[PDB]
Amino acid sequence: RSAATREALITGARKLWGLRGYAEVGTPEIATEAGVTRGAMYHQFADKAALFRDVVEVVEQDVMARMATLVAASGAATPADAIRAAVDAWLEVSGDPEVRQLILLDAPVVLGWAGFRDVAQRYSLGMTEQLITEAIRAGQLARQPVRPLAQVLIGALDEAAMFIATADDPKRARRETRQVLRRLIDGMLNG
Amino acid sequence: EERSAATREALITGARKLWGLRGYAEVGTPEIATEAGVTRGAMYHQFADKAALFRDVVEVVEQDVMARMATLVAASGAATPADAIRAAVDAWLEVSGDPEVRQLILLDAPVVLGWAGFRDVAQRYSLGMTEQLITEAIRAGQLARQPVRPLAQVLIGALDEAAMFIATADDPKRARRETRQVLRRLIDGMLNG
Numbered sequence A: 001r002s003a004a005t006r007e008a009l010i011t012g013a014r015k016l017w018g019l020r021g022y023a024e025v026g027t028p029e030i031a032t033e034a035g036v037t038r039g040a041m042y043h044q045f046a047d048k049a050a051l052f053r054d055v056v057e058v059v060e061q062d063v064m065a066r067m068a069t070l071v072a073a074s075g076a077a078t079p080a081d082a083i084r085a086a087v088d089a090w091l092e093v094s095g096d097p098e099v100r101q102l103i104l105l106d107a108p109v110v111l112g113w114a115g116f117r118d119v120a121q122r123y124s125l126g127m128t129e130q131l132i133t134e135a136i137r138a139g140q141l142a143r144q145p146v147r148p149l150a151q152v153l154i155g156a157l158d159e160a161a162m163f164i165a166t167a168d169d170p171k172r173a174r175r176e177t178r179q180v181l182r183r184l185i186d187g188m189l190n191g
Numbered sequence B: 001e002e003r004s005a006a007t008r009e010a011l012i013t014g015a016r017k018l019w020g021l022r023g024y025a026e027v028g029t030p031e032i033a034t035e036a037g038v039t040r041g042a043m044y045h046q047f048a049d050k051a052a053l054f055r056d057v058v059e060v061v062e063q064d065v066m067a068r069m070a071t072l073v074a075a076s077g078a079a080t081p082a083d084a085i086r087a088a089v090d091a092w093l094e095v096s097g098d099p100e101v102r103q104l105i106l107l108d109a110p111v112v113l114g115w116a117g118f119r120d121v122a123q124r125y126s127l128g129m130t131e132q133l134i135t136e137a138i139r140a141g142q143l144a145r146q147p148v149r150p151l152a153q154v155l156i157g158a159l160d161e162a163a164m165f166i167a168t169a170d171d172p173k174r175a176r177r178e179t180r181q182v183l184r185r186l187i188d189g190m191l192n193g
């Protein structure tokens, strides 16, 4: 009922905000894309930022699923290589124009730094802590506090992606940033 | 004129003090005007609104953060660029742990300035020092030759997240000790010396 209205609005908002940006598309154009009335939409989402919060949830869920698939298919032979593949998976997925617009450009502005970090952590801390735990278990990473290392790496990888997203020469920014991340990673990983 | 220039300094000092202690959202401009000993009219002549006074508070706090970082690195006795970077990472956790810096820069500024405004201020103050430390370490052969700006930006992301993780931790003393350990391991993995 309401569930069908919400899903149509989220799908339409993800589509139009992904192409043009949050700031460039109003709720009436999203209601049209979804095939619902302004009244039906206002019942589900009091304002534009509320609909954006639900779009970010669905997009970050998809980002983490896509990364998990790339890591499973990468052929990583050890936990250290799984971390390396996860970093390359994030640079790949972050380059999707919709992910760049919604997550790297719009989400920090609409959610703020605190809001962005909360979403980032809820979606990525589990996978990141698992990668670290498996590398420590395999003796390829020093025994150390898992949560602080996970948090710092998430902050480093989110900033890496945002640097590429806003660069004058994204292709060169991506190449140079991948090199930095690989050096940083390899300095923690043993052998 | 002289009284107006004194009024502006009293307002910045008073706002910095009270917002530092209670947070931006908990102190209004009338209380700040009272603290500074000036009328609402004198305050309005200097600052169009509450957020304009906050932008000037952030400037003086960031100036002091970067001065204190430079002082702590000079006080460390670092004799090589690698030791200067180690000292600068320790100095950031020290400076960002100051309760006024936590409140005004880590909690309030991202909300009041918004993302674009906050990052522009953060970059204007932090990118120069970070890039200088990297360039000196590359020149000394203590860091591999590489593009300076991408490495600087990734480390600033790591160091900003470290500070926010400590600022919001249930046990900040333990979060600071553990975060200092992981940052030291991260930089010691890249530094030749």
Ligand SMILES: O=C1C[C@H]2CCC[C@@H](C1)N2CCc1ccc(Cl)cc1
Binding pocket: A059, A060, A061, A063, A064, A086, A087, A090, A103, A119, A120, A121, A123, A124, A127, A128, A131, A153, A154, A157, A158
């Ligand atoms: O949707 C997500 C969650 C989080 C917030 C928004 C940007 C990206 C993608 N970061 C995760 C980046 C990341 C974390 C860990 C690893 Cl191993 C790789 C990438």
